[PDB]
């Protein structure tokens, strides 16, 4: 994936040169930031379940028709609610991963590429996931730079869906 290290390497390798000091500087920037990144990733991981369930519910409350309307795309039955819970986990797992790589690479490769195509084809509204993300953000219970890291990736997802 695009991680800050593989991007330094790709940039030196494109120009066929040894790593710049510019690049070494950058990778150390990622070493500094790494501490606020692992803090968030560990916490999101340990509260995964309550966060997924929490965000599901918030979406069912915001968009009540998703539990009431007929359709393979909706969460009116047990099959759809469980597709939805899974999809929300996915988003959370991807944020985890961004924090650990120190970039959007994982989310970009595993989820975002093809995202607009999938949502049109299976007729899922981006706005459901926006809401799940806003819930995760408002309820991770982190502060300082750990918060900043997590919210930057989550907002990234949210920009992806807008």
């Amino acid at each position: 994936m695009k991680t800050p290290i593989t991007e330094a390497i790709a940039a030196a390798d494109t120009q066929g040169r040894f790593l710049s000091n510019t690049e070494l500087q950058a990778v150390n920037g990622r070493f500094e930031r790494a501490a606020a990144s692992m803090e968030a990733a560990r916490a999101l991981t340990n509260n995964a379940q309550q966060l997924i369930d929490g965000a599901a519910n918030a979406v069912y409350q915001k968009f009540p028709y998703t539990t009431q309307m007929s359709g393979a795309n909706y969460a009116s039955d047990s099959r759809g609610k469980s597709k939805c819970a899974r999809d929300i986990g996915y988003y959370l797992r991807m944020v985890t991963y961004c924090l650990v790589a120190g970039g959007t690479g994982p989310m970009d490769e595993y989820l975002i590429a093809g995202l607009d195509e999938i949502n049109r084809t299976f007729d899922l509204s981006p706005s459901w996931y926006v809401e799940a993300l806003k819930y995760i953000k408002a309820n991770h219970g982190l502060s300082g730079q750990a918060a900043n890291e997590a919210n930057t990736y989550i907002d990234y997802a949210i920009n992806a869906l807008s």
Binding site: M1, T3, I5, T6, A8, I9, A10, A12, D13, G16, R17, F18, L19, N21, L24, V27, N28, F31, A34, A35, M38, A41, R42, T45, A48, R93, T96, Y97, V100, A101, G102, G105, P106, Y110
Partner: protein, 172 residues
């Protein structure tokens, strides 16, 4: 390509899993030696010319047939290409050193190199000897206690050795 972080992420994502305790530990440990890793890269990089030139000069002294008329390093186009190969291999060793994973060294440099050498009549074994000499030089420069906070880099020097050995092995 992968770095050490992305490697963990990708095998987590193949199995569907959030990262584990064990896994966060390991990846947090790569951030411990980050500063040393940067020194290694910087020290090898800042001496690329020397390592390449000295290795090559030593290679031609041991193996003079490379530098006679008809030899594979004879004519200036071939000597240039030979030197360039020494440099590329080093370059790829420094990338894998910064990444913490051999993936880029294999994928972008080593995959099918031996085949190219056989087809061209580049003595693979002679390149592996060159690589061998860049290893000793690069690790000496990287692991020299002058001009740096004293500390242990034996793990990192072991790794860096491993990246050279791979290159020697893929051509020789």
């Amino acid at each position: 390509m992968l770095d050490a972080f992305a490697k963990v992420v990708s095998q987590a994502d193949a199995k569907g899993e959030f990262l584990s305790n064990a896994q966060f530990d390991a990846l947090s440990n790569m951030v411990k030696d980050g500063s040393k890793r940067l020194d290694t890269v910087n020290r090898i990089t800042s001496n690329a010319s020397t390592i390449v030139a000295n290795a090559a000069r030593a290679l031609f002294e041991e193996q003079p047939q490379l530098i006679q008329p008809g030899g594979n390093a004879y004519t200036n186009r071939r000597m240039a290409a030979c030197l360039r190969d020494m440099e590329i291999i080093l370059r790829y060793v420094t990338y894998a050193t910064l990444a913490g994973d051999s993936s880029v060294l294999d994928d972008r440099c080593l995959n099918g190199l031996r085949e190219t050498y056989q087809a061209l009549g580049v003595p693979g074994s002679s390149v592996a000897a060159g690589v061998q000499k860049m290893k000793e030089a690069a690790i000496a420069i990287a692991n020299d206690p002058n001009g740096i906070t004293k500390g242990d880099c034996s793990a990192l020097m072991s790794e860096v050795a491993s990246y050279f050995d791979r290159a020697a092995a893929a051509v020789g």
